[PDB]
Amino acid sequence: VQLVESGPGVMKPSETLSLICAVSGDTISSPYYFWSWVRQPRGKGLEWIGGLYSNTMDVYYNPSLQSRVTISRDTSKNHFSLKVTSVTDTDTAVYYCARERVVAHNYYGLDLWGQGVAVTVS
Amino acid sequence: VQLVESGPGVMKPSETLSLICAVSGDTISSPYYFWSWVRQPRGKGLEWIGGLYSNTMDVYYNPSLQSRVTISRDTSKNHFSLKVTSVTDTDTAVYYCARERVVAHNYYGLDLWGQGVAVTVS
Amino acid sequence: DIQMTQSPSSLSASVGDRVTITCRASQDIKNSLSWYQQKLGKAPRRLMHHSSTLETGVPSRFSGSGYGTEFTLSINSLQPEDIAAYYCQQYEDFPLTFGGGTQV
Amino acid sequence: DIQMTQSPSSLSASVGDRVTITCRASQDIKNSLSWYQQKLGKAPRRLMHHSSTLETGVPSRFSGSGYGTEFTLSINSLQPEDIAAYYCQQYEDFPLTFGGGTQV
Amino acid sequence: EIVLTQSPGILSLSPGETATLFCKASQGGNAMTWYQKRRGQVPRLLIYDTSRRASGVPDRFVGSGSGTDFFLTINKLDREDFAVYYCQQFEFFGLGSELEVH
Amino acid sequence: AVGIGAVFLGFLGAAGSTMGAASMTLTVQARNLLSGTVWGIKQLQARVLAVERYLRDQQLLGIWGCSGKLICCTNVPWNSSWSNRNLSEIWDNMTWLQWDKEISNYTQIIYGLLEESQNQQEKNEQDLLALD
Amino acid sequence: AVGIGAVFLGFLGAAGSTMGAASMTLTVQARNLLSGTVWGIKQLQARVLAVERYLRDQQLLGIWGCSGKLICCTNVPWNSSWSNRNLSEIWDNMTWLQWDKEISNYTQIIYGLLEESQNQQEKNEQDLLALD
Amino acid sequence: AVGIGAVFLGFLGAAGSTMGAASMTLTVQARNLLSGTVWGIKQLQARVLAVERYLRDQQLLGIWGCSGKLICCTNVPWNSSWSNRNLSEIWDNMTWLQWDKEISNYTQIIYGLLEESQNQQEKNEQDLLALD
Amino acid sequence: AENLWVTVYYGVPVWKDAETTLFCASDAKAYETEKHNVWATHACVPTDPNPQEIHLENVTEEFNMWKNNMVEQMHTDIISLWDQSLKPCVKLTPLCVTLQCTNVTNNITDDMRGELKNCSFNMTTELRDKKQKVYSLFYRLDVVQINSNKEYRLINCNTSACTQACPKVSFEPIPIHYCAPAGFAILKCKDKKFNGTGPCPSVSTVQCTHGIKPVVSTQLLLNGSLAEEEVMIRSENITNNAKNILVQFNTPVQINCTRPNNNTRKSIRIGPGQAFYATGDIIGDIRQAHCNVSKATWNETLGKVVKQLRKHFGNNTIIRFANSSGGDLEVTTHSFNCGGEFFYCNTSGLFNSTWISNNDSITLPCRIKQIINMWQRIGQCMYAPPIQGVIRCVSNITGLILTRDGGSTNSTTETFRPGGGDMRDNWRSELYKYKVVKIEPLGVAPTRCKRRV
């Protein structure tokens, strides 16, 4: 089972950054798995964007970037999408989608990750 | 017109004490008559269990025995029932159903009474 | 919840006497007591409602008076069927509570 | 919102050493940090959840301790693949926040 | 298969009284049923599901019990009830308990 | 009192009493305002007419001086021209049925007066908790 | 905590926890009480049954000590005969499912006791804001 | 003012004014949210959609800092990243229609901060009225 | 202090057992081909995808499937939208005419009884004054002999004239996701070993249920949801021989069933716009339609159900299987749908073995009816029109329905006979895992806190 991301990276600022993360081998409708989008520009630290659970509705973000980012999730294509409107130059980064265990309800999970994709905004 | 009460009384403790009071000659659907269940063990005083009105819904008890006792009233058999669950040894008593006048609405009533049933619980 | 206390408790008087039984409450009721007379193994026959006016089928040899909290029963001519129990009972607020118990 | 601070920052040790990296929070978390190890251009491989019990697929050469707010990573036998990034991350309240960054 | 046994078999008693039949299934927890049958007529039901009587039968008949042990109580033995009485779960029946005028 | 000597606490139970007696039993008219082919359309429109009436009275109560308080004082004085009665004759002699006939002409001035009094008091609380 | 170490805040999400844990996540059972041919008659009677239940509970809440407050104290002391437990064993050991069985026989005395306590306190506030 | 010199108090009546003018006439948008074969099914689902929207807004109002208060302050401070405006340019120049587009991206964070502020303040009132 | 005080808490999660209505949901894929080509497309709404199934802890909920609700109202709901998919189709009251009818032109042998009757009759035309002589092929379970000359009539016409199915509407089951209205919740048990009643010690609350496909069968409930690892029986209770022991197994049995008689559809116009459909000519070679199952999977799955059926009856128990014993035609067979055709297949050749306590294919013949009388009402029939081509469909046998015979006085053989009977037990295996609850908030609990005056 591997998590494949997609999305080309070369764009213009104040525009439509869109990233897709999808699963191969299993499904996104498995219960109790923390989904996370976490970015990192090279030279700078690990920056947290988004995190939710697999089996509810209430979704969470970082408040310092919240007007720029939004997340989405659907199982008809098993897509896990990040949307950025009004991108600055401070989002040229590699990006990671992550499936983490919740540890009170799941001793038997596999802490899956994406490989990270590089988006460069001039 | 006479009230016939019924129910055998020789039972085991913490069980299903059930008493019936009924009317012969008249009906229980007559308006404005206070119904009462009042018990008395011999050697002890006159103890009040329950009292309601003939033509309402809201029902009243003594709060010190309220988890044990429940009352019921229905006119399709004209029954006026006392239900005691989880009895102690302090219910070995004679029991009286009573029909009393409300004195502001009824100058013409007959202040009726049950004959009293002795219930002995070992 | 309102407690009631009935005094005195145990009596044995001669014939033709006049006995008085008072009872007291825990808060002020001012108009609301009823008097009941219970013979041995029988249903209690009511003397009166509202402490000052009587029931039909009962003669004038019983009486009640008082106002407020302390009230008083008076029997002026004792008959031999009066060796029984008597009870004053409140009807101020739910639940109804009787007296302690007379033995006369 | 809860800030995290990770000390030290830039490290270079010899082989077979025992390195310790602590991190501190802004309010009391008492049970809640996870440790992640990220190599160059790769996905971060998690050391552990809940600061005292480990993940399968990772040996016993890593450890974490502490209680309350200040917590501490200890690597007792340094291997040559340890020149990478590490991060402690909170999960006390939303949002999750990582550490500063360990350049060992 | 599940075999029944009733406690009195033949009984020869007096009117006006109480009588407790007892039946004894061989595995417990059952749905107990009681039947009163006159000789040469239709058997009709007394008690379904161990406790509760039917409509139009007198309330002197009460069934009781639990587990593997079931009582059939009759209080104030009237003149009608000199009959036979059966107890059953589904596909078996008792031998037949008879209550007689003496 | 209660029981055998009771002016009756029933539904609409003391409607001819004096208003001092009807000032106690006041939840007994509030709690019986909810409960309750082609026939189910009639039943459905009965129940949604009931809860639309109850919601309009809760919203008309709420934007005056009380949220759900059921006994609610406010901050506008009482005029002599609406009643010209003393207090003792309306709390010791008069019934609520007659009171709703003595005031029917002076309705829809009291409600607009409550709305102005509550709206000016809300902006007074707004500026008083603003300026400190 | 939250996230990867969370006793789960979901709908009915902590229903087997201890009441100290379920004392926090309390709006999560409130806000999922509204949302939701011959078939539309069944659908509309489901939704008006839902809002009639919610209105009966808002009206039963409001005539006690709290309008919509969601955590609500009052002025009647707690009796020993209802529970006979200590505080620590119900806030540190017991679940709400078991608690609803333990006070199942002691319902419909507590609600009438709240009604008398709130009605007497409202008339106490009435006379106390009257006499000054 | 009113009458012949009035910015019009009607339904939606001052909707292009400055927010200081629309801070007065505020019940006029509240009270027109209630009123209002196969056709009766469409009519009844219109009215129960209306009262379901109104009940969801009353329940969303109530679990924040105000039950039905209609002007309602709270205890979370205002962030510069939401508007970066002065007070005078939004209370002396801007309209509510243009305000709702300026702060449309900053919704569903303010409601989360309202819920945490009210829930922590209610538990602060619980522990403050507990320990005394 | 020691005088604790009551607080009312709102929105305590507790639940109580209750009965209410439910509310449907389906996929988006059912609306792509649109507007009543299958039922319930104008009835109820599309779902939210990925049901928000959230597990609970330290809760024991008492489940029961036999006094359960919601399996009744699916049995009313399917019948109600079955009537709603049959109201606007054409009544076939002008069809009941005296038939003149013969054999189909076939090499008749004396032992095989002919399954086709070729009848010609009078029928009205579009103009009411002209009438036409038309011919059809009918199956012998739909034609009876009224009393040299052989004149026939349709079987329904001394009961009620009845309704053609429209060939717009299909018959394959789309899944239905059952889902909860506002103010109730649905609890799911998720144990493996779970036989119906008692405490389930791991529950999950869900928003909407999973995919349930309503597929009618009498014996052999097919396309059903499997178990987790073992083979489980379930019962109301086993020692009662009235309620059906229903058995559900893990690994399916693939069943191939087919009709090879190549059919031609023919339209006859009854009058104005009443396009009656009949069979036309039979081309190819006339055979008998039949079902097939593989031998080895049948032998091994029957070994697994006799292994898990021996646990309730002692280990020294001889268990054999017979076919059904009587009744009408819809309980001796297993009766099932395939692509718009009704099949009634005689399952004697499956349930016939004993067992002791120590390429390969089974065929079974199958008849074809056309007037059905679904759910055994009085004044209803659904006429299926016939479909082109060789009809072929595969399916998955999952669960069987077994009633015992009353084996008495000590001898340890206990026969089992399949016969389904009631329609609900092909749903109660599909819905044994949920119960509905009503949330009752406003708990009352003490604390050490008093309200300021």
Ligand SMILES: *[C@@H]1O[C@H](CO)[C@@H](O[C@@H]2O[C@H](CO)[C@@H](O[C@@H]3O[C@H](CO[C@H]4O[C@H](CO)[C@@H](O)[C@H](O)[C@@H]4O)[C@@H](O)[C@H](O[C@H]4O[C@H](CO)[C@@H](O)[C@H](O)[C@@H]4O[C@H]4O[C@H](CO)[C@@H](O)[C@H](O)[C@@H]4O)[C@@H]3O)[C@H](O)[C@H]2NC(C)=O)[C@H](O)[C@H]1NC(C)=O
């Ligand atoms: C238990 O579960 C199994 C698994 O699903 C199920 O088996 C399925 O049965 C259905 C029967 O309804 C089968 O569905 C039919 O399949 C054929 C062939 O489909 C294959 O080929 C097409 C290419 O043409 C592929 O796209 C497809 O993926 C398959 O590979 C179709 O021809 C059928 O469609 C016709 O019939 C429908 C019903 O009338 C019409 O709606 C549809 O539009 C098509 O109509 C055609 O025929 C009409 C008359 O002949 C004509 O008028 C039209 O113009 C048009 O020509 C239908 O899709 C399905 O394939 C089976 N699954 C598998 C894997 O084989 C069992 O049925 C189920 N058990 C029960 C009891 O339900």
Ligand SMILES: *[C@@H]1O[C@H](CO)[C@@H](O[C@@H]2O[C@H](CO)[C@@H](O[C@@H]3O[C@H](CO[C@H]4O[C@H](CO)[C@@H](O)[C@H](O)[C@@H]4O)[C@@H](O)[C@H](O[C@H]4O[C@H](CO)[C@@H](O)[C@H](O)[C@@H]4O)[C@@H]3O)[C@H](O)[C@H]2NC(C)=O)[C@H](O)[C@H]1NC(C)=O
């Ligand atoms: C469900 O499915 C099963 C099998 O799939 C069916 O079971 C078999 O059904 C047949 C009847 O349909 C049973 O009977 C056998 O039929 C033979 C047919 O011969 C006919 O024709 C000759 C000449 O025309 C006549 O003489 C004869 O009487 C018949 O009219 C019989 O010949 C068979 O006879 C047997 O016994 C005699 C002596 O008793 C011998 O001479 C024969 O050689 C032969 O051994 C026989 O009677 C058959 O037995 C069934 N099988 C089993 C295993 O029992 C079910 O009928 C079917 N049910 C339904 C409802 O569909």
Ligand SMILES: *[C@@H]1O[C@H](CO)[C@@H](O[C@@H]2O[C@H](CO)[C@@H](O[C@@H]3O[C@H](CO[C@H]4O[C@H](CO)[C@@H](O)[C@H](O)[C@@H]4O)[C@@H](O)[C@H](O[C@H]4O[C@H](CO)[C@@H](O)[C@H](O)[C@@H]4O)[C@@H]3O)[C@H](O)[C@H]2NC(C)=O)[C@H](O)[C@H]1NC(C)=O
């Ligand atoms: C169910 O029962 C019905 C009866 O109601 C049968 O219908 C008839 O079946 C027979 C047998 O096929 C048909 O007879 C054949 O008719 C062919 C064409 O005739 C039609 O067209 C001519 C005009 O060209 C008309 O005059 C005539 O009336 C018909 O309308 C003939 O060509 C056939 O001749 C055969 O033999 C010659 C010998 O040289 C060959 O050269 C030919 O190729 C051919 O093989 C024959 O006479 C009859 O037409 C049918 N009637 C109708 C109304 O259809 C059904 O057959 C039966 N069902 C089944 C399934 O068999």
Ligand SMILES: *[C@@H]1O[C@H](CO)[C@@H](O[C@@H]2O[C@H](CO)[C@@H](O[C@@H]3O[C@H](CO)[C@@H](O)[C@H](O[C@H]4O[C@H](CO)[C@@H](O)[C@H](O)[C@@H]4O)[C@@H]3O)[C@H](O)[C@H]2NC(C)=O)[C@H](O)[C@H]1NC(C)=O
């Ligand atoms: C359908 O299935 C079974 C078998 O026919 C039957 O279930 C039985 O239920 C009762 C209780 O639900 C079980 O009884 C238990 O058994 C022990 C034996 O030691 C007893 O102590 C108890 O039985 C009595 O106790 C109850 C109080 O606890 C009484 O209220 C009651 O009357 C019982 O008689 C204990 O509960 C019993 O074991 C099962 N049987 C099996 C095989 O598990 C059920 O009643 C059947 N239903 C019908 C309609 O036939």
Ligand SMILES: *[C@@H]1O[C@H](CO)[C@@H](O[C@@H]2O[C@H](CO)[C@@H](O[C@@H]3O[C@H](CO)[C@@H](O)[C@H](O[C@H]4O[C@H](CO)[C@@H](O)[C@H](O)[C@@H]4O)[C@@H]3O)[C@H](O)[C@H]2NC(C)=O)[C@H](O)[C@H]1NC(C)=O
């Ligand atoms: C039903 O399930 C819930 C969900 O798990 C469960 O709540 C939690 O249970 C666990 C254990 O079952 C509790 O964890 C321990 O609790 C004990 C006493 O309660 C504490 O002493 C423990 O603290 C230890 O751990 C610390 C850090 O590891 C050490 O520093 C310390 O010295 C102790 O050794 C530990 O917390 C947990 O507390 C509860 N949760 C809450 C909020 O109380 C619940 O108990 C289950 N209910 C039943 C009836 O089984």
Ligand SMILES: *[C@@H]1O[C@H](CO)[C@@H](O[C@@H]2O[C@H](CO)[C@@H](O[C@@H]3O[C@H](CO)[C@@H](O)[C@H](O)[C@@H]3O)[C@H](O)[C@H]2NC(C)=O)[C@H](O)[C@H]1NC(C)=O
């Ligand atoms: C379709 O409709 C036609 C038209 O009615 C039917 O034809 C008619 O059938 C009747 C039988 O009830 C014939 O009556 C009989 O005629 C013979 C002589 O042919 C006579 O000897 C008998 O005593 C009897 O009266 C009638 O003649 C016939 N009509 C014509 C014009 O000949 C026909 O039966 C219907 N069915 C089919 C399959 O065609």
Ligand SMILES: *[C@@H]1O[C@H](CO)[C@@H](O[C@@H]2O[C@H](CO)[C@@H](O[C@@H]3O[C@H](CO)[C@@H](O)[C@H](O)[C@@H]3O)[C@H](O)[C@H]2NC(C)=O)[C@H](O)[C@H]1NC(C)=O
């Ligand atoms: C279930 O299996 C048994 C075991 O074979 C079936 O019993 C057999 O059924 C056939 C069909 O009825 C009997 O054949 C006879 O055929 C002639 C032909 O017309 C008929 O006239 C006879 O009356 C009889 O039907 C066969 O004798 C019979 N065997 C026994 C021992 O009775 C049974 O039919 C099967 N059940 C079903 C519904 O298929």
Ligand SMILES: *[C@@H]1O[C@H](CO)[C@@H](O[C@@H]2O[C@H](CO)[C@@H](O)[C@H](O)[C@H]2NC(C)=O)[C@H](O)[C@H]1NC(C)=O
């Ligand atoms: C035409 O069909 C009839 C029945 O519709 C057949 O007639 C009889 O069928 C039974 C079968 O149950 C046989 O036992 C009889 O021997 C048949 N009778 C005759 C006279 O054959 C008939 O076989 C079919 N074919 C023909 C040419 O008439």
Ligand SMILES: *[C@@H]1O[C@H](CO)[C@@H](O[C@@H]2O[C@H](CO)[C@@H](O)[C@H](O)[C@H]2NC(C)=O)[C@H](O)[C@H]1NC(C)=O
């Ligand atoms: C269904 O199975 C469960 C457990 O698998 C049974 O429940 C208990 O099983 C144990 C094991 O023998 C018994 O000791 C208990 O007495 C059973 N308890 C109860 C309440 O039954 C259960 O009996 C089975 N039920 C059926 C109908 O098969």
Ligand SMILES: *[C@@H]1O[C@H](CO)[C@@H](O[C@@H]2O[C@H](CO)[C@@H](O)[C@H](O)[C@H]2NC(C)=O)[C@H](O)[C@H]1NC(C)=O
């Ligand atoms: C039912 O039919 C399917 C296909 O219609 C059969 O599956 C085939 O089985 C043969 C035998 O092993 C294989 O060679 C084919 O490759 C299979 N094809 C497919 C598409 O699966 C199936 O075997 C039939 N069932 C039975 C019991 O024979």
Ligand SMILES: *[C@@H]1O[C@H](CO)[C@@H](O[C@@H]2O[C@H](CO)[C@@H](O)[C@H](O)[C@H]2NC(C)=O)[C@H](O)[C@H]1NC(C)=O
């Ligand atoms: C049903 O069972 C019977 C016996 O119980 C089977 O009949 C025997 O089948 C074997 C296998 O060929 C033969 O050797 C015997 O001679 C048969 N005996 C009789 C009396 O027929 C029968 O095969 C079974 N049915 C099916 C469809 O397998």
Ligand SMILES: *[C@@H]1O[C@H](CO)[C@@H](O[C@@H]2O[C@H](CO)[C@@H](O)[C@H](O)[C@H]2NC(C)=O)[C@H](O)[C@H]1NC(C)=O
């Ligand atoms: C079943 O019948 C149909 C029609 O009766 C047959 O379809 C024909 O197939 C040939 C193949 O080339 C076509 O040329 C014809 O045009 C088709 N007929 C029609 C009317 O379109 C089909 O072959 C038959 N199937 C089998 C298995 O025999």
Ligand SMILES: *[C@@H]1O[C@H](CO)[C@@H](O[C@@H]2O[C@H](CO)[C@@H](O)[C@H](O)[C@H]2NC(C)=O)[C@H](O)[C@H]1NC(C)=O
């Ligand atoms: C019928 O049985 C077959 C196998 O016996 C089932 O096929 C498997 O289904 C799962 C779920 O989609 C797939 O992951 C497997 O790959 C399938 N097996 C094969 C060999 O392809 C099938 O789902 C069952 N149900 C239906 C409706 O056909």
Ligand SMILES: *[C@@H]1O[C@H](CO)[C@@H](O)[C@H](O)[C@H]1NC(C)=O
């Ligand atoms: C009564 O109202 C009128 C106008 O509304 C006013 O002029 C008058 O002063 C008022 N009197 C009192 C006593 O409020």
Ligand SMILES: *[C@@H]1O[C@H](CO)[C@@H](O)[C@H](O)[C@H]1NC(C)=O
């Ligand atoms: C109030 O108005 C009615 C008519 O609306 C009138 O007849 C009546 O006289 C008025 N009341 C008084 C006290 O004048």
Ligand SMILES: *[C@@H]1O[C@H](CO)[C@@H](O)[C@H](O)[C@H]1NC(C)=O
């Ligand atoms: C509990 O209630 C009863 C009557 O309701 C009362 O007599 C008793 O004093 C109460 N006890 C406490 C501790 O409140």
